[PDB]
Design a protein around this ligand. Sequence first.
Ligand SMILES: CC(C)CCC[C@@H](C)[C@H]1CC[C@H]2[C@@H]3CC=C4C[C@@H](O)CC[C@]4(C)[C@H]3CC[C@]12C
Ligand SMILES: CC(C)CCC[C@@H](C)[C@H]1CC[C@H]2[C@@H]3CC=C4C[C@@H](O)CC[C@]4(C)[C@H]3CC[C@]12C
Ligand SMILES: CC(C)CCC[C@@H](C)[C@H]1CC[C@H]2[C@@H]3CC=C4C[C@@H](O)CC[C@]4(C)[C@H]3CC[C@]12C
Ligand SMILES: CC(C)CCC[C@@H](C)[C@H]1CC[C@H]2[C@@H]3CC=C4C[C@@H](O)CC[C@]4(C)[C@H]3CC[C@]12C
Ligand SMILES: CC(C)CCC[C@@H](C)[C@H]1CC[C@H]2[C@@H]3CC=C4C[C@@H](O)CC[C@]4(C)[C@H]3CC[C@]12C
Ligand SMILES: CC(C)CCC[C@@H](C)[C@H]1CC[C@H]2[C@@H]3CC=C4C[C@@H](O)CC[C@]4(C)[C@H]3CC[C@]12C
Lengths: 101, 101, 101, 101, 101, 101
Amino acid sequence: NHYASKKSAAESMLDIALLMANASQLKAVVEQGPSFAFYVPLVVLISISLVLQIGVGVLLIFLVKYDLNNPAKHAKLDFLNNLATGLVFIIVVVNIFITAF
Amino acid sequence: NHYASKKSAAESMLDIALLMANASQLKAVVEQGPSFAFYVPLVVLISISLVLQIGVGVLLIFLVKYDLNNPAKHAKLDFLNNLATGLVFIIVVVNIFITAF
Amino acid sequence: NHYASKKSAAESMLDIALLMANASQLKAVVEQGPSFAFYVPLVVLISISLVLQIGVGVLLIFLVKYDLNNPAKHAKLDFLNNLATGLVFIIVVVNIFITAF
Amino acid sequence: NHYASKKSAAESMLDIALLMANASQLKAVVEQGPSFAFYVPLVVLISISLVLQIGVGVLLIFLVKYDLNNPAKHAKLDFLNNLATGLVFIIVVVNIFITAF
Amino acid sequence: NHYASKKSAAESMLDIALLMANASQLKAVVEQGPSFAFYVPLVVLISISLVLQIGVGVLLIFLVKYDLNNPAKHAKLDFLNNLATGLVFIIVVVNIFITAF
Amino acid sequence: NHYASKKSAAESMLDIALLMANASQLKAVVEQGPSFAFYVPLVVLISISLVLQIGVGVLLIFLVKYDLNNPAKHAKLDFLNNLATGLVFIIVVVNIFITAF
Ligand SMILES: CC(C)CCC[C@@H](C)[C@H]1CC[C@H]2[C@@H]3CC=C4C[C@@H](O)CC[C@]4(C)[C@H]3CC[C@]12C
Ligand SMILES: CC(C)CCC[C@@H](C)[C@H]1CC[C@H]2[C@@H]3CC=C4C[C@@H](O)CC[C@]4(C)[C@H]3CC[C@]12C
Ligand SMILES: CC(C)CCC[C@@H](C)[C@H]1CC[C@H]2[C@@H]3CC=C4C[C@@H](O)CC[C@]4(C)[C@H]3CC[C@]12C
Ligand SMILES: CC(C)CCC[C@@H](C)[C@H]1CC[C@H]2[C@@H]3CC=C4C[C@@H](O)CC[C@]4(C)[C@H]3CC[C@]12C
Ligand SMILES: CC(C)CCC[C@@H](C)[C@H]1CC[C@H]2[C@@H]3CC=C4C[C@@H](O)CC[C@]4(C)[C@H]3CC[C@]12C
Ligand SMILES: CC(C)CCC[C@@H](C)[C@H]1CC[C@H]2[C@@H]3CC=C4C[C@@H](O)CC[C@]4(C)[C@H]3CC[C@]12C
């Protein structure tokens, strides 16, 4: 099976529990309604968190391939790693505030 | 039997359990009625998910052929693998939200 | 007997068990009546699958002849195999939905 | 402006007048209601017609490539032209019935 | 415009006045209902007539291409022309009966 | 000023009048209410169109640099151009359907 091989290499560029955690709390706040406090900050915090994770996922997909095919661009490769590290860093900050609120 | 060989080679370019999972809940949400909540997001999420899987399968069918007949275009083949990985990646992200909602 | 030889070679160009499977539900959905839910999506889904199986079978009949008589046109023969695989891939996707619905 | 250059090349691979004609009548039949006759055959005919135009467009987009970059694979190139011609041939036949109904 | 060129090339493989006539009378007999006599023969004759025209059109698309790319197989091309001529012969015979009834 | 040059180089990578059109129609459909018909298809089509426009903008931003610094990999650049053309094709189809509805 070729799709399973693609699926295995596609789940290796992200985590599963956090999106399941993110989706479950996004679902809970939606049904409760705008009457509940912190509705507006929670929706935007989840939305920006999901977008950043998607951007990191596509970033990681195209990054590990440079680790094998052509590592000549030593300077460029490190800068991409730091950007991925920084994007994950801001992701966990939103998740810290999401759980707190 | 020549059709059996085609079916085996075409069933190996995708997964089956996920497609039945999408179709089973698609019937459930459609027959349940628009009155129940999350009807609209589930319908569009399943619809876009199914469309991408067809595109991935079509992408994969024309992909494994180049792995044997002519591997000279390494750059084009390597990028095509990355695009397939990204499309599968966004499929599992949508599927995570479908089960949650 | 020459017709028996043609029948054997023509039955190898398609699958058999699925055909009565498609035919049996087509009779059931037609006999039960339009009042039964999901009637309309069932007829079109069965109809398109039946049309595509005929196209695939016709494609398979004219394809194996080139495999022995004249295999020089490798590029054209290779693409025909991919088209046959892609067409069958649509068949398996569609049949999943009739089974689910 | 680079986007407009892409748009000009992308509009050269399809027709606009038929698409608005298909979309205008799709809106009319949908908004009119299922009470009027020929509701279903019109919807499925437009739907299969619309899918084929997208399939023709992507076929034509990747077909202009081979006429200039590498015309060495002639036999594959002529066959792809016939498939592109065949796909459009079905589209006009379908549109004839849409106009009549 | 490349789609217009394909449409023009696919327009030369069939006629318009006959298809619109067939579709117009198909709508008339269908709307009137089975109460009006000759309903069953009219539907089947129009149905088989339309099927052959698509087969003739697809036949003509793949036939004129051999007239220019590779005319070496004169014997096979001659037989194909007779089949196309024969297929048109039954089409015009069938259409005579549709007008008569 | 260095920010003005970046603004010009970023505005040259996309079309703007379509952006005011999309924003205005989105505001209209959002404000006038869900009671209006075609509300949901309009909203989802506008959303996917905007997402695709951002994707095309990013593609063009990262592709224009590739045209000058290192043109050695012709195949990858040409395939990226084809992908951008197809994305603009689907964007213009979605915008046609938005205008129709
Ligand atoms: C804009 C930032 C802050 C968030 C969004 C990030 C996403 C959409 C973008 C921004 C930077 C982009 C990367 C920039 C450079 C490269 C190197 C190239 O050879 C492969 C693609 C890759 C790896 C890009 C992938 C997409 C990318 C990760
Ligand atoms: C339009 C994109 C974003 C989503 C839909 C993907 C489908 C419709 C398209 C987009 C990319 C396409 C592929 C791009 C390149 C090639 C290499 C060619 O030698 C065989 C076909 C193949 C493999 C194409 C098949 C069709 C394809 C898979
Ligand atoms: C039109 C498409 C999308 C669906 C219908 C498929 C049928 C009607 C058509 C489309 C492509 C066609 C094939 C194209 C090329 C050849 C190779 C030739 O040596 C024998 C006929 C054969 C094998 C054709 C048989 C009929 C065929 C299979
Ligand atoms: C599945 C068929 C019957 C209908 C849908 C057609 C679309 C989705 C598919 C089927 C055949 C495909 C083409 C097959 C071969 C080529 C030649 C290659 O150099 C570029 C991609 C291109 C041009 C593909 C693009 C996508 C394509 C046009
Ligand atoms: C079976 C007959 C009586 C009716 C149906 C006709 C259609 C479906 C079939 C039957 C014979 C077929 C043709 C047989 C041989 C060729 C020559 C080849 O170079 C291109 C395809 C082409 C032109 C085929 C196209 C499809 C075709 C015309
Ligand atoms: C996922 C696809 C189908 C739609 C979304 C497109 C965006 C998110 C992605 C997918 C393809 C990506 C591009 C793929 C390849 C390259 C070439 C490199 O030199 C610069 C980055 C660039 C240009 C990427 C930028 C980000 C990109 C445009």
